[PDB]
């Protein structure tokens, strides 16, 4: 293991193998309390966001929202083998909220579809 | 979108389409810290309750507890089309803990039953 953020300079593919290392490190006188609470609030906001998308229990969560190409026109090898996550975050920053909005709509439709499928005797 | 609580006066059916709006707005010196910690405790208590029921990753969670009629004798059209959630919450207040207890018991059986099903070679 490379340790916390040791994969930051690695490729996105290789870096995807260390997600639990950072996951452990998001959680582990007034200033100490306030920072502990802030860390909790950031953790919960990200977990709550994953829950909205139906990804509450997964670190790698596949979705049903297609990639629109305009967001990034790179091939799979260009992204996963020739780039780091820092470069990707910069490249995709302007479209992050768009993607998040689409993910929310997809899960909402999925919940209705599940609700209807479970109502067929 | 109608915005935060904009569906409060809408019918329960219509209001069921905006669950993510309120969910997002549940998270988004001593006094500041006490209030934000309290918001976290309420969020976590509700998430824990959904977890106990097996609803940890869903906003619309379909369970296996039958409706006992005594709780409310209205049919589906009278409830989902002719009422708001505030009216329902008032009508079902005296039975809320009964339903919650049943939900807990139902999930416990399912977990034990799943544990047994996974023990069959």
């Amino acid at each position, epitope marked *: 293991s490379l340790g916390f953020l040791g994969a930051a300079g690695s490729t996105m593919g290789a870096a995807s193998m260390t997600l639990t290392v950072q996951a452990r490190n998001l959680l582990s006188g007034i200033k100490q309390l306030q920072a502990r609470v802030l860390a909790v609030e950031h953790y919960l906001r990200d977990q709550q966001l994953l829950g909205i998308w139906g990804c509450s229990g997964k670190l790698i969560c596949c979705t049903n929202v297609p990639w629109n190409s305009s967001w990034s026109n790179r091939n799979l090898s260009e992204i996963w083998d020739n780039m780091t996550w820092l470069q990707w975050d910069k490249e995709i920053s302007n479209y992050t909220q768009i993607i998040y909005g689409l993910l929310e709509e997809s899960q909402n*439709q999925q919940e*209705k*579809n599940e*609700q*209807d*499928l*479970l*109502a*067929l*005797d | 979108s109608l915005g935060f609580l904009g569906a409060a006066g809408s019918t*329960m*059916g219509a209001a*069921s389409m905006t669950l993510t709006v309120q969910a997002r707005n549940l998270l988004s010196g001593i006094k500041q810290l006490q209030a934000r910690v309290l918001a976290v405790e309420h969020y976590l208590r509700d998430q824990q309750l959904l977890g106990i029921w097996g609803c940890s990753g869903k906003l619309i969670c379909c369970t296996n507890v039958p409706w006992n009629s005594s709780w409310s004798n209205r*049919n*589906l*059209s009278e409830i*989902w089309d002719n009422m708001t959630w505030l009216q329902w919450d008032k009508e079902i207040s005296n039975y809320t803990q009964i339903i919650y207890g049943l939900l807990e018991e139902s999930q416990n059986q399912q977990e034990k039953n799943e544990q047994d099903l996974l023990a069959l070679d």
Partner: antibody, heavy 122, light 109 residues
Framework: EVQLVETGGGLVQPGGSLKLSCRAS????????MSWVRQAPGKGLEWVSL????????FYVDSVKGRFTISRDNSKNTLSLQMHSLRDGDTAVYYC??????????????????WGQGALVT | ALTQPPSVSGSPGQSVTISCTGT?????????VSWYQQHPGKAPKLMIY???QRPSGVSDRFSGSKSGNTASLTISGLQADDEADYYC???????????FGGGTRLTVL
């Protein structure tokens, strides 16, 4: 007061692909599930395909599952069935019908409460 | 398909029963049956839905029931305007949604 009017041609070559559509009025279009049911000229009724009220879920009989697509547009109040392969056993009057499913927040259907006149396809 | 008699008959005013027989996986297990009245040249109209329910606009003369795997339609007070091909249907399941029987020609003597 409720009307369902099927539109489309009635004769296509084998191996051709045809499309049927149905316009409807007299009710809120988006509140009901719909289906297509067919009847060969000398046979009884056969259910062909069903679509939900929102259009996200579709179901087909196995004999047409890989060749028919059912879709709806709730802003134009239109339900369309696109047929592919169109093998002969598929000559029938195709009826537009309302019902057969509900949203789980509505009473059970499992019946067809309104029918159109039917597009005869040979 | 469902089993349904090819034809029935009777005089005006007579009570006529049209049977429909399925299997345990469809009409037996599920209480979701229906009956349709198809006059020649017209689309079928719904006469019965559910085991014992009737759409608004349908005369009280049309009724039905289910016992075991056998469902039936009974028309009391038979009129000349009731001469038609009748069909039974039932919900079968999530894999197969609806199953229809053949038609029964009801003729008025």
């Amino acid at each position: 007061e409720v009307q369902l009017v099927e539109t489309g041609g009635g004769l296509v070559q084998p191996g051709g692909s045809l499309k049927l559509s149905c316009r409807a009025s007299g009710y809120t279009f988006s509140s009901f599930a719909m289906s297509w049911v067919r009847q060969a000229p000398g046979k009884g009724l056969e259910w062909v395909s069903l679509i939900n009220d929102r259009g996200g879920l579709t179901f087909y009989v196995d004999s047409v599952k890989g060749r028919f697509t059912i879709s709806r547009d709730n802003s134009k109040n239109t339900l369309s069935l696109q047929m592919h392969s169109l093998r002969d056993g598929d000559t029938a009057v195709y009826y537009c019908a309302t019902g057969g499913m509900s949203s789980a927040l509505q009473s059970s259907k499992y019946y067809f409460d309104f029918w159109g006149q039917g597009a005869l396809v040979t | 398909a469902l089993t349904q008699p090819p034809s029935v008959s009777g005089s005006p005013g007579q009570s006529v029963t049209i049977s429909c027989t399925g299997t345990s996986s469809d009409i037996g297990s599920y209480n979701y049956v229906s009956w349709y009245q198809q006059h020649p040249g017209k689309a079928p109209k719904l006469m019965i839905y559910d085991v014992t329910q009737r759409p608004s606009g349908v005369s009280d003369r049309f009724s039905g029931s289910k016992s075991g795997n056998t469902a039936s339609l009974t028309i009391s007070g038979l009129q000349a305007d009731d001469e038609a091909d009748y069909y039974c249907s039932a919900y079968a399941g999530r894999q197969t949604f609806y199953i229809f029987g053949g038609g029964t020609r009801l003729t008025v003597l």
